[PDB]
């Protein structure tokens, strides 16, 4: 019957191990229009990123207000316990809670019209990240699924809350807007559709927490503002075009001024857009 | 117990007569603040439904889009659930590729829908985590959800009584009680439920 939740049961082959060509490169490697939009619109972000920046802070004592100028995007991606409890991992660093998540003064960063990308968990983190963006004065907008494949690992894996009914295989990262954006006449601040609310990837190795990389580039694709700021991040998620701020980061090169120049006269906080771009890119 | 089912207003209907279930599913058309091409229930109408009526203790799967996101969130907890899972069904096409292209969202594209999985009492007899939390499944005919989630709601509760609230002609299962108001009129084999009917509909 081509039940793919059956044949789970049957042989431990999640049912997204069926879904085809979700790569970055094989996804359009038979769409040469739909590669195109992708590349150049990648090469648009390339042009006009700033270095990488970065910062280690304790977070948790850290006034937020010495991060400047405000921001277009933030990437949220605070360590749940969950993280360490479903994989059994000893965290290295401090676990956050919801509670210590929601303290955060992240409305005190974000620009007027701005986006937030929260990384949830699978659990009590689909409720209260919610009331976190509620906090922040943010209103969620879309809901963007890791959804992780055991292809190379066939079976099945005990989820650890005792509350969950069904194997969890996913994590959600929650999009939240701010201010007044209209996506058919704001083409200057975002492409809207360039990107589906899905990624799909293998299981990482054990001890491994990193999110996908993928991540980045739905944001990038969709914001035109120049500011992302990456909260938590690590040394190995420092990108250019992105101002990293963490408490396990080796090292510190953020300068607030030299930072602010990147984006002030006679430079813009948006990348503009170039023609070719303006023809191929979804619009309605 | 074969397929039963009721032709109704899920508004209207006295569900008291229905009996305690072990899941109730439901797949609403709800007001998503958007010009559709089918009537939607009011977001005061849902929250009025008396789903409490209908559970001591078991799941509900509440199948939600859009603003109902949050709206449905609410009205788990209006109807005494706690959500303690969320299913998504992902999606694709024939050749079992998402669909990537289009404008299917506001912001971004969807790949998925979403079904809220919330808890009421303390069931037993169930069997958890034989499951995965993601479908994988065509878009088959007029269907708005999977019909894989019988087979895991089947063996996550193997034998018990089930009702679906919205349910479509197609959608009528063994072990199901069917609401809606697209079915062929009223079936009921349960002859406890039979009795229940005629006490409270004498004229039928």
């Known amino acids: 019957h081509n039940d793919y939740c059956q044949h789970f049961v049957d042989t431990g082959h999640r049912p997204q191990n069926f879904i085809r060509d979700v790569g970055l490169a094989d996804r359009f490697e038979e769409y040469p229009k739909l590669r195109e939009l992708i590349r150049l619109k990648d090469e648009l972000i390339a042009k006009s990123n700033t270095p990488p920046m970065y910062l280690q802070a304790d977070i948790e004592a850290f006034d937020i207000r010495e991060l400047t100028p405000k921001f277009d995007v933030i990437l949220l991606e605070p360590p749940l316990e969950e993280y360490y409890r479903e994989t059994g991992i000893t965290a290295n660093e401090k676990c956050w809670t919801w509670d210590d998540i929601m303290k955060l003064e992240i409305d005190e960063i974000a620009a007027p019209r701005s986006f937030i990308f929260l990384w949830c968990g699978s659990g009590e983190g689909l409720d209260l990240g919610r009331v976190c963006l509620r906090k922040w004065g943010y209103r969620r907008c879309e809901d963007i699924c890791w959804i992780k494949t055991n292809k190379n690992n066939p079976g099945k894996?005990?989820?650890?809350?005792?509350?969950?009914?069904?194997?969890?295989?996913?994590?959600?990262?929650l999009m939240g807007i701010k201010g007044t954006v209209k996506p058919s006449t704001d083409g200057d601040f975002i492409h809207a559709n360039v990107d589906i609310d899905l990624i799909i990837t293998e299981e990482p190795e054990i001890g491994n927490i990193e999110k996908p990389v993928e991540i980045f580039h739905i944001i990038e694709h969709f914001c035109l503002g120049r500011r992302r700021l990456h909260l938590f991040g690590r040394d190995s998620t420092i990108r250019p075009g992105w101002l990293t701020?963490?408490?396990?980061?080796?090292?510190?090169?953020?300068?607030?001024?030299?930072?602010?120049?990147?984006?002030?006269?006679?430079?813009?906080?948006?990348?503009?857009?170039?023609?070719?771009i303006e023809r191929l890119r979804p619009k309605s | 117990f074969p397929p039963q089912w009721i032709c109704?207003?899920?508004?209207?209907?006295?569900?008291?007569?229905?009996?305690?279930?072990?899941?109730?599913?439901?797949?609403?058309?709800?007001?998503?603040?958007?010009?559709?091409?089918?009537?939607?229930?009011?977001?005061?109408?849902?929250?009025?439904?008396?789903?409490?009526?209908?559970?001591?203790?078991?799941?509900?799967?509440?199948?939600?889009?859009?603003?109902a996101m949050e709206l449905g969130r609410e009205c788990l907890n209006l109807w005494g659930y706690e959500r303690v899972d969320e299913?998504?069904?992902?999606?694709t096409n024939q050749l079992q590729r998402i669909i990537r292209t289009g404008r299917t969202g506001h912001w971004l594209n969807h790949g998925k829908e979403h079904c809220l999985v919330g808890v009421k009492g303390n069931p037993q007899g169930f069997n958890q985590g034989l499951d995965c939390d993601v479908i994988v499944?065509?878009?088959?005919?007029?269907?708005?959800?999977?019909?894989?989630?019988?087979?895991?709601?089947?063996?996550?509760?193997?034998?018990?009584?089930?009702?679906?609230?919205?349910?479509?002609?197609?959608?009528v299962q063994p072990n199901w009680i069917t609401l809606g108001n697209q079915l062929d009129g009223i079936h009921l084999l349960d002859p406890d439920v039979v009795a229940r009917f005629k006490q409270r509909y004498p004229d039928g």
Request: proline share 7%.
């Open chain 1, 157 to 173: 894996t005990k989820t650890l809350d005792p509350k969950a009914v069904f194997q969890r295989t996913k994590e959600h990262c």
């Open chain 1, 245 to 276: 701020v963490g408490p396990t980061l080796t090292n510190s090169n953020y300068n607030a001024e030299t930072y602010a120049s990147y984006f002030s006269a006679p430079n813009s906080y948006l990348t503009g857009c170039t023609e070719e």
């Open chain 2, 8 to 67: 109704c207003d899920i508004r209207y209907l006295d569900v008291s007569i229905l009996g305690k279930f072990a899941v109730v599913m439901a797949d609403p058309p709800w007001d998503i603040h958007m010009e559709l091409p089918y009537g939607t229930l009011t977001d005061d109408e849902m929250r009025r439904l008396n789903i409490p009526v209908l559970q001591d203790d078991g799941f509900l799967f509440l199948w939600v889009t859009g603003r």
């Open chain 2, 87 to 91: 299913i998504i069904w992902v999606k």
């Open chain 2, 137 to 171: 499944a065509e878009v088959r005919s007029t269907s708005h959800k999977p019909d894989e989630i019988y087979g895991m709601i089947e063996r996550l509760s193997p034998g018990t009584r089930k009702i679906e609230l919205f349910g479509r002609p197609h959608n």
